[PDB]
């Protein structure tokens, strides 16, 4: 599915992402916008043989297991296929592990380049 902006904000808030590990909700909404355009089925292949999966473009080298990525670590202990559900539970649970690993939201390239440093609260305004 393709979430609306406020629709995703409300779901992410229900799943505990607002202010999680120091990142207000607008960060997470902005990240999803620029990672997946709010589509829970987005996938993108990378040069290292990994693929990024779902609404938060979670990577198959470090975080989820897709069975076809060399050097897989599966640190979220989740099959990547589960991260293509229209229900965001598994992607949120893995994102919480990613953002707790020691480099904050910098794991999300699109957030780093297109969200960080902007007024991210705008992404929840009006919701
Ligand atoms: Cl998979």
GROMACS .gro file of N, CA and C and ligand atoms in nm:
model
  382
    1UNK      N    1   0.084  -0.123   0.000
    1UNK     CA    2   0.000   0.000   0.000
    1UNK      C    3   0.085   0.125   0.000
    2UNK      N    4   0.021   0.234  -0.037
    2UNK     CA    5   0.081   0.367  -0.036
    2UNK      C    6   0.010   0.445   0.074
    3UNK      N    7   0.083   0.478   0.180
    3UNK     CA    8   0.029   0.557   0.290
    3UNK      C    9   0.017   0.703   0.250
    4UNK      N   10  -0.087   0.770   0.303
    4UNK     CA   11  -0.084   0.914   0.312
    4UNK      C   12   0.010   0.960   0.422
    5UNK      N   13   0.048   1.088   0.416
    5UNK     CA   14   0.142   1.144   0.512
    5UNK      C   15   0.089   1.134   0.654
    6UNK      N   16  -0.027   1.194   0.681
    6UNK     CA   17  -0.079   1.188   0.816
    6UNK      C   18  -0.121   1.047   0.854
    7UNK      N   19  -0.167   0.967   0.758
    7UNK     CA   20  -0.201   0.828   0.787
    7UNK      C   21  -0.080   0.753   0.840
    8UNK      N   22   0.035   0.770   0.775
    8UNK     CA   23   0.157   0.705   0.823
    8UNK      C   24   0.203   0.765   0.955
    9UNK      N   25   0.193   0.897   0.971
    9UNK     CA   26   0.232   0.957   1.098
    9UNK      C   27   0.154   0.895   1.214
   10UNK      N   28   0.023   0.879   1.196
   10UNK     CA   29  -0.059   0.823   1.302
   10UNK      C   30  -0.020   0.679   1.331
   11UNK      N   31   0.007   0.600   1.227
   11UNK     CA   32   0.047   0.462   1.247
   11UNK      C   33   0.183   0.453   1.315
   12UNK      N   34   0.279   0.533   1.270
   12UNK     CA   35   0.410   0.533   1.332
   12UNK      C   36   0.402   0.575   1.478
   13UNK      N   37   0.316   0.672   1.511
   13UNK     CA   38   0.299   0.712   1.650
   13UNK      C   39   0.239   0.598   1.733
   14UNK      N   40   0.139   0.527   1.679
   14UNK     CA   41   0.082   0.413   1.751
   14UNK      C   42   0.189   0.307   1.778
   15UNK      N   43   0.285   0.294   1.687
   15UNK     CA   44   0.392   0.195   1.700
   15UNK      C   45   0.513   0.247   1.779
   16UNK      N   46   0.502   0.364   1.842
   16UNK     CA   47   0.604   0.409   1.936
   16UNK      C   48   0.723   0.482   1.879
   17UNK      N   49   0.715   0.532   1.757
   17UNK     CA   50   0.830   0.599   1.700
   17UNK      C   51   0.844   0.746   1.738
   18UNK      N   52   0.740   0.812   1.788
   18UNK     CA   53   0.753   0.954   1.819
   18UNK      C   54   0.853   0.973   1.932
   19UNK      N   55   0.965   1.041   1.902
   19UNK     CA   56   1.071   1.071   1.997
   19UNK      C   57   1.158   0.950   2.031
   20UNK      N   58   1.139   0.838   1.961
   20UNK     CA   59   1.213   0.716   1.990
   20UNK      C   60   1.362   0.741   1.972
   21UNK      N   61   1.440   0.712   2.077
   21UNK     CA   62   1.585   0.728   2.073
   21UNK      C   63   1.626   0.871   2.037
   22UNK      N   64   1.538   0.967   2.065
   22UNK     CA   65   1.568   1.107   2.039
   22UNK      C   66   1.521   1.161   1.906
   23UNK      N   67   1.442   1.086   1.829
   23UNK     CA   68   1.397   1.129   1.697
   23UNK      C   69   1.247   1.151   1.695
   24UNK      N   70   1.207   1.278   1.686
   24UNK     CA   71   1.066   1.312   1.680
   24UNK      C   72   1.000   1.252   1.556
   25UNK      N   73   0.867   1.241   1.562
   25UNK     CA   74   0.789   1.168   1.461
   25UNK      C   75   0.814   1.220   1.320
   26UNK      N   76   0.830   1.351   1.303
   26UNK     CA   77   0.850   1.406   1.171
   26UNK      C   78   0.974   1.352   1.102
   27UNK      N   79   1.078   1.321   1.178
   27UNK     CA   80   1.195   1.255   1.120
   27UNK      C   81   1.157   1.125   1.050
   28UNK      N   82   1.076   1.043   1.115
   28UNK     CA   83   1.040   0.911   1.063
   28UNK      C   84   0.950   0.922   0.941
   29UNK      N   85   0.860   1.020   0.941
   29UNK     CA   86   0.771   1.041   0.828
   29UNK      C   87   0.850   1.093   0.709
   30UNK      N   88   0.938   1.192   0.732
   30UNK     CA   89   1.024   1.241   0.625
   30UNK      C   90   1.111   1.129   0.570
   31UNK      N   91   1.167   1.047   0.658
   31UNK     CA   92   1.249   0.935   0.613
   31UNK      C   93   1.170   0.845   0.519
   32UNK      N   94   1.048   0.806   0.559
   32UNK     CA   95   0.968   0.717   0.475
   32UNK      C   96   0.935   0.782   0.341
   33UNK      N   97   0.904   0.912   0.342
   33UNK     CA   98   0.873   0.982   0.217
   33UNK      C   99   0.987   0.966   0.118
   34UNK      N  100   1.108   0.996   0.161
   34UNK     CA  101   1.219   0.998   0.069
   34UNK      C  102   1.285   0.862   0.050
   35UNK      N  103   1.264   0.766   0.141
   35UNK     CA  104   1.313   0.631   0.122
   35UNK      C  105   1.225   0.551   0.025
   36UNK      N  106   1.093   0.554   0.044
   36UNK     CA  107   1.002   0.463  -0.025
   36UNK      C  108   0.885   0.534  -0.091
   37UNK      N  109   0.878   0.666  -0.082
   37UNK     CA  110   0.760   0.740  -0.126
   37UNK      C  111   0.632   0.686  -0.061
   38UNK      N  112   0.644   0.643   0.064
   38UNK     CA  113   0.533   0.592   0.144
   38UNK      C  114   0.476   0.457   0.094
   39UNK      N  115   0.548   0.383   0.008
   39UNK     CA  116   0.500   0.255  -0.046
   39UNK      C  117   0.562   0.142   0.035
   40UNK      N  118   0.478   0.060   0.096
   40UNK     CA  119   0.527  -0.051   0.177
   40UNK      C  120   0.597  -0.160   0.095
   41UNK      N  121   0.585  -0.158  -0.038
   41UNK     CA  122   0.646  -0.262  -0.122
   41UNK      C  123   0.768  -0.215  -0.198
   42UNK      N  124   0.817  -0.094  -0.173
   42UNK     CA  125   0.936  -0.046  -0.243
   42UNK      C  126   1.054  -0.139  -0.218
   43UNK      N  127   1.130  -0.168  -0.324
   43UNK     CA  128   1.254  -0.244  -0.312
   43UNK      C  129   1.359  -0.186  -0.405
   44UNK      N  130   1.485  -0.184  -0.361
   44UNK     CA  131   1.593  -0.131  -0.443
   44UNK      C  132   1.720  -0.213  -0.424
   45UNK      N  133   1.776  -0.262  -0.535
   45UNK     CA  134   1.899  -0.340  -0.534
   45UNK      C  135   2.020  -0.247  -0.529
   46UNK      N  136   2.124  -0.291  -0.458
   46UNK     CA  137   2.247  -0.215  -0.437
   46UNK      C  138   2.367  -0.287  -0.500
   47UNK      N  139   2.476  -0.211  -0.516
   47UNK     CA  140   2.595  -0.265  -0.581
   47UNK      C  141   2.655  -0.383  -0.505
   48UNK      N  142   2.638  -0.387  -0.373
   48UNK     CA  143   2.700  -0.494  -0.295
   48UNK      C  144   2.620  -0.624  -0.295
   49UNK      N  145   2.515  -0.634  -0.376
   49UNK     CA  146   2.430  -0.751  -0.379
   49UNK      C  147   2.316  -0.748  -0.280
   50UNK      N  148   2.310  -0.647  -0.194
   50UNK     CA  149   2.199  -0.634  -0.100
   50UNK      C  150   2.083  -0.563  -0.168
   51UNK      N  151   1.969  -0.566  -0.100
   51UNK     CA  152   1.848  -0.498  -0.141
   51UNK      C  153   1.792  -0.427  -0.019
   52UNK      N  154   1.732  -0.310  -0.043
   52UNK     CA  155   1.661  -0.235   0.061
   52UNK      C  156   1.512  -0.263   0.045
   53UNK      N  157   1.443  -0.290   0.156
   53UNK     CA  158   1.307  -0.341   0.154
   53UNK      C  159   1.210  -0.253   0.232
   54UNK      N  160   1.099  -0.217   0.168
   54UNK     CA  161   0.982  -0.165   0.237
   54UNK      C  162   0.981  -0.015   0.261
   55UNK      N  163   0.885   0.023   0.346
   55UNK     CA  164   0.853   0.162   0.377
   55UNK      C  165   0.974   0.238   0.430
   56UNK      N  166   1.065   0.168   0.501
   56UNK     CA  167   1.187   0.229   0.555
   56UNK      C  168   1.314   0.171   0.491
   57UNK      N  169   1.302   0.102   0.378
   57UNK     CA  170   1.418   0.064   0.297
   57UNK      C  171   1.528  -0.001   0.382
   58UNK      N  172   1.489  -0.107   0.451
   58UNK     CA  173   1.579  -0.177   0.542
   58UNK      C  174   1.667  -0.273   0.462
   59UNK      N  175   1.797  -0.270   0.492
   59UNK     CA  176   1.900  -0.334   0.411
   59UNK      C  177   1.923  -0.480   0.448
   60UNK      N  178   1.941  -0.562   0.345
   60UNK     CA  179   1.957  -0.706   0.359
   60UNK      C  180   2.101  -0.751   0.385
   61UNK      N  181   2.198  -0.660   0.386
   61UNK     CA  182   2.331  -0.700   0.429
   61UNK      C  183   2.342  -0.703   0.581
   62UNK      N  184   2.292  -0.601   0.650
   62UNK     CA  185   2.308  -0.592   0.794
   62UNK      C  186   2.185  -0.632   0.873
   63UNK      N  187   2.065  -0.606   0.823
   63UNK     CA  188   1.948  -0.599   0.911
   63UNK      C  189   1.846  -0.710   0.891
   64UNK      N  190   1.802  -0.737   0.769
   64UNK     CA  191   1.706  -0.843   0.745
   64UNK      C  192   1.769  -0.946   0.652
   65UNK      N  193   1.716  -1.068   0.656
   65UNK     CA  194   1.769  -1.178   0.576
   65UNK      C  195   1.681  -1.199   0.452
   66UNK      N  196   1.741  -1.187   0.333
   66UNK     CA  197   1.671  -1.218   0.209
   66UNK      C  198   1.727  -1.340   0.136
   67UNK      N  199   1.821  -1.413   0.198
   67UNK     CA  200   1.872  -1.536   0.143
   67UNK      C  201   1.958  -1.523   0.019
   68UNK      N  202   1.984  -1.402  -0.030
   68UNK     CA  203   2.061  -1.384  -0.152
   68UNK      C  204   2.168  -1.276  -0.140
   69UNK      N  205   2.200  -1.234  -0.017
   69UNK     CA  206   2.294  -1.124   0.006
   69UNK      C  207   2.421  -1.175   0.071
   70UNK      N  208   2.537  -1.159   0.010
   70UNK     CA  209   2.661  -1.203   0.075
   70UNK      C  210   2.691  -1.119   0.198
   71UNK      N  211   2.749  -1.184   0.299
   71UNK     CA  212   2.786  -1.118   0.422
   71UNK      C  213   2.669  -1.082   0.511
   72UNK      N  214   2.555  -1.150   0.495
   72UNK     CA  215   2.435  -1.117   0.571
   72UNK      C  216   2.460  -1.133   0.720
   73UNK      N  217   2.410  -1.038   0.799
   73UNK     CA  218   2.415  -1.047   0.945
   73UNK      C  219   2.279  -1.059   1.013
   74UNK      N  220   2.169  -1.022   0.947
   74UNK     CA  221   2.034  -1.039   1.000
   74UNK      C  222   2.020  -0.990   1.144
   75UNK      N  223   2.068  -0.869   1.169
   75UNK     CA  224   2.068  -0.818   1.306
   75UNK      C  225   1.928  -0.786   1.358
   76UNK      N  226   1.829  -0.770   1.270
   76UNK     CA  227   1.691  -0.759   1.316
   76UNK      C  228   1.622  -0.894   1.334
   77UNK      N  229   1.687  -1.003   1.296
   77UNK     CA  230   1.629  -1.137   1.304
   77UNK      C  231   1.489  -1.141   1.243
   78UNK      N  232   1.484  -1.107   1.115
   78UNK     CA  233   1.356  -1.102   1.044
   78UNK      C  234   1.380  -1.130   0.897
   79UNK      N  235   1.297  -1.211   0.831
   79UNK     CA  236   1.308  -1.221   0.685
   79UNK      C  237   1.270  -1.089   0.620
   80UNK      N  238   1.346  -1.051   0.517
   80UNK     CA  239   1.316  -0.926   0.447
   80UNK      C  240   1.176  -0.928   0.389
   81UNK      N  241   1.125  -1.047   0.352
   81UNK     CA  242   0.992  -1.053   0.293
   81UNK      C  243   0.885  -0.998   0.387
   82UNK      N  244   0.905  -1.013   0.518
   82UNK     CA  245   0.805  -0.964   0.613
   82UNK      C  246   0.799  -0.813   0.612
   83UNK      N  247   0.904  -0.747   0.564
   83UNK     CA  248   0.910  -0.602   0.561
   83UNK      C  249   0.840  -0.543   0.441
   84UNK      N  250   0.778  -0.627   0.357
   84UNK     CA  251   0.696  -0.582   0.246
   84UNK      C  252   0.547  -0.594   0.277
   85UNK      N  253   0.512  -0.623   0.402
   85UNK     CA  254   0.372  -0.622   0.444
   85UNK      C  255   0.317  -0.480   0.441
   86UNK      N  256   0.186  -0.468   0.419
   86UNK     CA  257   0.120  -0.338   0.432
   86UNK      C  258   0.108  -0.295   0.578
   87UNK      N  259   0.125  -0.388   0.671
   87UNK     CA  260   0.130  -0.359   0.814
   87UNK      C  261   0.275  -0.327   0.851
   88UNK      N  262   0.298  -0.212   0.916
   88UNK     CA  263   0.434  -0.162   0.935
   88UNK      C  264   0.503  -0.219   1.057
   89UNK      N  265   0.441  -0.314   1.128
   89UNK     CA  266   0.496  -0.363   1.255
   89UNK      C  267   0.641  -0.409   1.241
   90UNK      N  268   0.668  -0.498   1.146
   90UNK     CA  269   0.801  -0.557   1.139
   90UNK      C  270   0.904  -0.453   1.098
   91UNK      N  271   0.869  -0.362   1.007
   91UNK     CA  272   0.961  -0.256   0.968
   91UNK      C  273   0.990  -0.161   1.085
   92UNK      N  274   0.887  -0.126   1.163
   92UNK     CA  275   0.910  -0.040   1.280
   92UNK      C  276   1.000  -0.110   1.380
   93UNK      N  277   0.972  -0.238   1.408
   93UNK     CA  278   1.050  -0.309   1.509
   93UNK      C  279   1.196  -0.315   1.469
   94UNK      N  280   1.223  -0.338   1.341
   94UNK     CA  281   1.361  -0.340   1.294
   94UNK      C  282   1.422  -0.201   1.295
   95UNK      N  283   1.347  -0.099   1.252
   95UNK     CA  284   1.397   0.037   1.257
   95UNK      C  285   1.440   0.075   1.398
   96UNK      N  286   1.365   0.031   1.499
   96UNK     CA  287   1.402   0.063   1.636
   96UNK      C  288   1.537   0.003   1.671
   97UNK      N  289   1.564  -0.119   1.623
   97UNK     CA  290   1.695  -0.180   1.644
   97UNK      C  291   1.803  -0.104   1.569
   98UNK      N  292   1.775  -0.063   1.444
   98UNK     CA  293   1.874   0.008   1.364
   98UNK      C  294   1.914   0.138   1.432
   99UNK      N  295   1.816   0.217   1.477
   99UNK     CA  296   1.842   0.349   1.533
   99UNK      C  297   1.903   0.341   1.672
  100UNK      N  298   1.901   0.223   1.735
  100UNK     CA  299   1.965   0.200   1.864
  100UNK      C  300   2.109   0.151   1.850
  101UNK      N  301   2.157   0.128   1.728
  101UNK     CA  302   2.286   0.063   1.707
  101UNK      C  303   2.405   0.156   1.727
  102UNK      N  304   2.385   0.287   1.734
  102UNK     CA  305   2.495   0.375   1.770
  102UNK      C  306   2.521   0.491   1.675
  103UNK      N  307   2.453   0.494   1.559
  103UNK     CA  308   2.468   0.602   1.462
  103UNK      C  309   2.333   0.666   1.430
  104UNK      N  310   2.237   0.657   1.521
  104UNK     CA  311   2.111   0.728   1.504
  104UNK      C  312   2.042   0.695   1.373
  105UNK      N  313   1.981   0.797   1.312
  105UNK     CA  314   1.910   0.779   1.186
  105UNK      C  315   2.002   0.787   1.064
  106UNK      N  316   2.133   0.797   1.085
  106UNK     CA  317   2.225   0.808   0.972
  106UNK      C  318   2.224   0.683   0.884
  107UNK      N  319   2.169   0.570   0.934
  107UNK     CA  320   2.155   0.451   0.850
  107UNK      C  321   2.068   0.477   0.728
  108UNK      N  322   1.978   0.574   0.734
  108UNK     CA  323   1.886   0.604   0.625
  108UNK      C  324   1.947   0.716   0.541
  109UNK      N  325   2.003   0.679   0.425
  109UNK     CA  326   2.072   0.775   0.339
  109UNK      C  327   1.979   0.890   0.300
  110UNK      N  328   1.855   0.858   0.265
  110UNK     CA  329   1.763   0.962   0.221
  110UNK      C  330   1.730   1.057   0.336
  111UNK      N  331   1.718   1.005   0.458
  111UNK     CA  332   1.698   1.093   0.572
  111UNK      C  333   1.819   1.183   0.592
  112UNK      N  334   1.939   1.124   0.587
  112UNK     CA  335   2.061   1.200   0.606
  112UNK      C  336   2.071   1.314   0.505
  113UNK      N  337   2.033   1.288   0.380
  113UNK     CA  338   2.058   1.385   0.274
  113UNK      C  339   1.945   1.484   0.254
  114UNK      N  340   1.821   1.444   0.284
  114UNK     CA  341   1.704   1.521   0.244
  114UNK      C  342   1.613   1.558   0.360
  115UNK      N  343   1.635   1.505   0.480
  115UNK     CA  344   1.556   1.540   0.597
  115UNK      C  345   1.638   1.610   0.704
  116UNK      N  346   1.753   1.553   0.741
  116UNK     CA  347   1.832   1.607   0.850
  116UNK      C  348   1.866   1.753   0.825
  117UNK      N  349   1.848   1.838   0.927
  117UNK     CA  350   1.875   1.979   0.915
  117UNK      C  351   1.758   2.064   0.869
  118UNK      N  352   1.651   2.002   0.818
  118UNK     CA  353   1.529   2.074   0.784
  118UNK      C  354   1.432   2.073   0.901
  119UNK      N  355   1.328   2.155   0.890
  119UNK     CA  356   1.220   2.155   0.988
  119UNK      C  357   1.132   2.031   0.969
  120UNK      N  358   1.171   1.920   1.032
  120UNK     CA  359   1.101   1.795   1.008
  120UNK      C  360   0.963   1.793   1.073
  121UNK      N  361   0.934   1.882   1.168
  121UNK     CA  362   0.801   1.887   1.226
  121UNK      C  363   0.695   1.918   1.122
  122UNK      N  364   0.733   1.984   1.012
  122UNK     CA  365   0.638   2.009   0.905
  122UNK      C  366   0.572   1.881   0.856
  123UNK      N  367   0.640   1.766   0.868
  123UNK     CA  368   0.586   1.643   0.814
  123UNK      C  369   0.468   1.590   0.895
  124UNK      N  370   0.449   1.636   1.018
  124UNK     CA  371   0.332   1.598   1.097
  124UNK      C  372   0.234   1.713   1.115
  125UNK      N  373   0.262   1.828   1.057
  125UNK     CA  374   0.176   1.943   1.073
  125UNK      C  375   0.041   1.918   1.007
  126UNK      N  376  -0.066   1.955   1.077
  126UNK     CA  377  -0.200   1.935   1.026
  126UNK      C  378  -0.260   1.799   1.052
  127UNK      N  379  -0.184   1.706   1.110
  127UNK     CA  380  -0.232   1.570   1.130
  127UNK      C  381  -0.310   1.558   1.261
  128LIG    CL1  382   1.311  -1.266   0.216
   0.00000   0.00000   0.00000
